[PDB]
């Protein structure tokens, strides 16, 4: 789970 698509 991340905050941005590219993280």
């Amino acid at each position: 789970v991340v905050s941005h698509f590219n993280d």
Partner: antibody
Amino acid sequence: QVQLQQPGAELVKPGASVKLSCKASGFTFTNYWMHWVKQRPGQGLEWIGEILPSNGRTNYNEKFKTKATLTVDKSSNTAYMQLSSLTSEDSAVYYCARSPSDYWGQGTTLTVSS
Amino acid sequence: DIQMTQTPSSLSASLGDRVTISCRASQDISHYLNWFQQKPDGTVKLLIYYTSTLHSGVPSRFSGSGSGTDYSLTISNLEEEDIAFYFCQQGGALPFTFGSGTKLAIKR
């Protein structure tokens, strides 16, 4: 623990340039995007761009492309954002942040006045 | 760029009240919707990311929901430390963009 250390404020003159620092601590910033965001009271919040310290890859908001240049210093675990040709339009609070598991700096209040 | 429409811009509530703040994107952002909270001293924290994941240390009274274009942040029972400025950010596409903010105040 995870912290991003930014200077409180700076006053610079129109036409000069400024290099804002963002020192990370509590983590090694190699594999985290380091973002920059501009906050000026009327206008909302604007994302300037991010840099990935490991390979220096950058993604900018087109609007800020030769206003803002992002770099990094791996030995000091520090992220920098140079703002050139400063105008009154550039006075604002500038934040740095990491992502994922985001943390933000306290923000640097930059005033550009002659 | 994806425009984020945040409502309401301002809201007053009393301690213990349920509070709901919403963000709508102009494009699908694939659940990458983040909620930030900002205090008067300028401190900013990420509260919730990927629509509904609470960040480290955030209290269980916070929660988020949504999908597609339509997202919301809810505080089930308001506390005083929640009185703040809230803003969403979509992280589904570059350049990342922010909602306009919600100033949450105390009703008297």
